[PDB]
Amino acid sequence: DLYLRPGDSQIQFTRHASDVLLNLNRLRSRDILTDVVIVVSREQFRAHKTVLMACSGLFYSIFTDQLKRNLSVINLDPEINPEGFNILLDFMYTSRLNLREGNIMAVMATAMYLQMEHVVDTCRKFIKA
Amino acid sequence: DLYLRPGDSQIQFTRHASDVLLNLNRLRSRDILTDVVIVVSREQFRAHKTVLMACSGLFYSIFTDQLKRNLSVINLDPEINPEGFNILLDFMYTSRLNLREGNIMAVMATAMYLQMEHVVDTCRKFIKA
Ligand SMILES: [Cl-]
Ligand SMILES: [Cl-]
């Protein structure tokens, strides 16, 4: 629960990061302080820009551009499949990835588009088996 | 790095939550998408409202009030010590708590005011020894 480590006098909390993400997912479930809608083939997904930027290289690049920083709606490539995006948005807020035989190619394609390198790497590992 | 668990078919990522928090702290360091300033005895601290709400019962209560939701400046009780607040803001974004003999009473008092129950519990454990 707590531990100490070398070269650093601070107390380390093992559960804090998971608790923060859990509470951020609760905010999303309740639509509290969400500040962007992502549009994927007419499907709409509400989210927190900071969480998107902390998980996706695409969204990091988008919202660090001064012109795009304050946009409230982001339209993605119409070829992106909404189910794949939904799975990856859930992953962002949960650390849990719904990979199945029937969606892994779409999830991998969407994670490459979003620049989510650890999801892509994981997809390639499962494909190889 | 990855694991499976019962009652849930999804892949579990062990490092994701810590990576999200690390990237959120990077956004804070760069002042990217910060949306509130907390004022503590004339000292000013920039932060992300969603992270404050995910860590502090006080900030959760504040920003779920419709009148206070869009405030850009929050003034805290003038008796709160800025060093204690700084230590707890760092903890929110890092899972690391700078507890010392010389600050533990102030940090505990500030964590009670912010309603950060796991920090308070930890302070009481260290005090008892
Ligand atoms: Cl990733
Ligand atoms: Cl806490």
Numbering used by the authors:
A (entry chain A), B (entry chain A): -1 to 127
Quote the passages of the study that discuss this structure, keeping the authors' original sentences.
Here, we report the functionalization of the BTB (bric à-brac, tramtrack and broad complex) domain from the transcriptional repressor BCL6 to serve as a promiscuous assembly block that may assist the crystallization of a guest protein. The 129-residue BCL6 BTB domain forms a symmetrical strand-exchanged homodimer that contains two lateral grooves that bind corepressors with high affinity. We showed that these can mediate the formation of a variety of highly porous lattices, and that a guest protein may be incorporated into a BTB-domain lattice by its genetic fusion to a corepressor peptide that binds to the lateral groove of the BTB domain with high affinity. We have shown that the surface of the BCL6 BTB domain contains versatile interaction interfaces with the potential to mediate diverse lattices in a range of crystallization conditions.
We sought to determine whether this sequence could promote crystallization of the BCL6 BTB domain when fused directly to it, and made a chimeric BTB protein in which SSDLYLRPG was covalently linked to its N-terminus (NCoR1BBD2-BCL6BTB). The SSDLYLRPG sequence similarly enhanced both crystallization and diffraction quality in this context, and we solved the structure of the NCoR1BBD2-BCL6BTB chimera to 1.6 Å resolution [Fig. 1(b) and Table 1]. Crystallization of both the BCL6BTB/NCoR1BBD2 complex and the NCoR1BBD2-BCL6BTB chimera was favoured in conditions of high ionic strength, and the crystals had similar cell dimensions and the same packing in space group P6122. In the crystals of the BCL6BTB/NCoR1BBD2 complex and of the NCoR1BBD2-BCL6BTB chimera, the NCoR1BBD2 sequence simultaneously interacts with two regions of the BTB domain: the first is the β1 strand located in the lower part of the lateral groove of the BTB domain and the second is a region we refer to as the hydrophobic patch (HP) located on the surface of the BTB domain between residues 60 and 72. A peptide molecule thereby tethers two BTB dimers together in the lattice [Figs. 1(c) and 1(d)].
